[PDB]
Design a protein around this ligand. Sequence first.
Ligand code: HEM
Ligand code: CAH
Ligand code: K
Length: 406
Amino acid sequence: ANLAPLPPHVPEHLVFDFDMYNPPNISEGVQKAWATLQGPNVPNIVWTRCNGGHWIATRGRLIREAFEDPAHFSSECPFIPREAGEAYDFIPTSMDPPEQRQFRALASSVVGMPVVDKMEGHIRELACSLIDNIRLQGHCNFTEDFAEPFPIRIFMLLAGLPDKDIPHLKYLSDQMTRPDGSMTFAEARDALYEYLMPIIAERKLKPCTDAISVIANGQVNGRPITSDEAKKMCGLLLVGGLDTVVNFLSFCMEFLAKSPEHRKELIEHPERIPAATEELLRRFSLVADGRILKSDLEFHGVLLKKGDQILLPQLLSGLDERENACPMHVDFGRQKVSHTTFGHGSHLCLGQHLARREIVTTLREWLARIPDFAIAPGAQVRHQSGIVSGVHALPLVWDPATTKAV
Ligand code: HEM
Ligand SMILES: CC1(C)[C@H]2CC(=O)[C@]1(C)C[C@H]2O
Ligand SMILES: [K+]
C-alpha cells in the first residue's frame, strides 16, 4: 500500500495507515476488520496515508456530526480516492442542500414505499421460486444462486431492463465500489452512461411505467429534467440496485448458517423478523463513503483544511461500543438498535424500503423451507472491502429431508 507524503498540517500522532480497500485482519470478517479503527490505541480522528491521504472519523458521534454538517463536509467529492470522488457525478448524492432536495423527491418516486408495495407480489414470488428449485439439492452457492439473482432481477423489473444485461451492468457497478483496476471510476461511469443514454432517449419517445421512464419524463423546479441529469440519476439507482442488497444478504446468511439459536428464534417467533432485520443491518453494515471540507475547520481539536477528504464510514456507528454495548454480538432483543447503516443527514438512503422488504422476504421464505443449514465443511468464506463491502462465495449445505414444501 503506497503512502502519500504527510501534509505539513497533519501531526504524526494522528497517523494511522488504514486502507479502506484492504483493512487489516479481513479474515476475521470485514466489519471486524473495520472495527480495528475503534481499538484502544486509536484516536477518534485519524489520518491515513493510503489512497492519496485522507482523514477518517472512527466514532459514531463524530460520523453523525459530520453528516449533519454539509456546510463544512460537502458531498461534491464523496468517494476515496480523490480521483473517484472527482469523477463521481451521480444525482442526488453529489449535491448539497438545497439543490439536492427536489432531485431526491424525483428519485424517491421510483423506489419509494408506494412502489415497494406495488412490487411485493413480484418480490415474494421470485424469492419463493429461487428457494424452491434449490431446496432439494442440499447445497448451493448462495451468492450466485440467490444473493445476486433475487435483488438484481427485482431491480431490472422495476427499471424495465432486459436482464441479460445483468452481467455487464453488475460488472460495471462492482468497478465503482470494489475496483479491480482495469478501469478508472470515470471509465466505468462512462460505460454505464453509454448503456443508459439511448434507453433514456428511447423512453422519452415511448414512455412505460418503469423507473427509467418516470425519471426521464420528470420535472425539477417546474421544468423538464434534462438528459444529462436523468442519466446521473438513473446511474445511481443502477449501482444501488445491483451492489448493495446483494452483498448484504450474503453477510446475513453466513451469520445465520453458524447460529442455530438465531434461526429458531425467527421460525418460532415470525413477528421478530423485522426487529432482527434491524439488528443484522447494524452488525453487517457495509457502506462507507466520505465528504470533502469546504473550509478549514477545527473539528474536535483537529485542524482539517479546505479540500481535505474525510471518510465517514456509515458502517462504523453501529459497531461503536459507545453506541451499542457488546457491539459484535447479534442480539435480536437489543432494546435500542443504534446504527447509520442507511446513512445520516439529508442523504439518508432512498431505497431502504426496498432493501428491508427484500431482507425480510429472504429471511421468512428461506427459513420456511430450509430451517437447518450450515456452511460447507472446510469452506473459507472470504470477504472484500471497498465503498460497499462484500462476500466472495458462500457455499451452504443442508439435509433435503429436513427441508419443507410450502
Ligand atoms: C442494504 C442495502 C443498502 C444500504 C446499506 C444502502 C446505503 C446507503 C447509504 C449509506 C447512503 C448514503 C450515502 C451518502 O451519504 O453519501 C445511501 C444513499 C442512497 N441510496 Fe442506498 N443503500 C442500500 C440499498 C439501496 C437500494 C436497493 C437502492 C435502490 C436504488 C438505494 C438507493 C439510494 C439512493 C437513491 C441514495 C441517495 C439519497 C440521496 O443522496 O439523497 N440504496 N444508501
Ligand atoms: C453509497 C451507495 C450505497 C449509495 C450511493 C452510492 O454510490 C452507493 C454505493 C449505492 C447508493 O445506494
Ligand atoms: K461533481
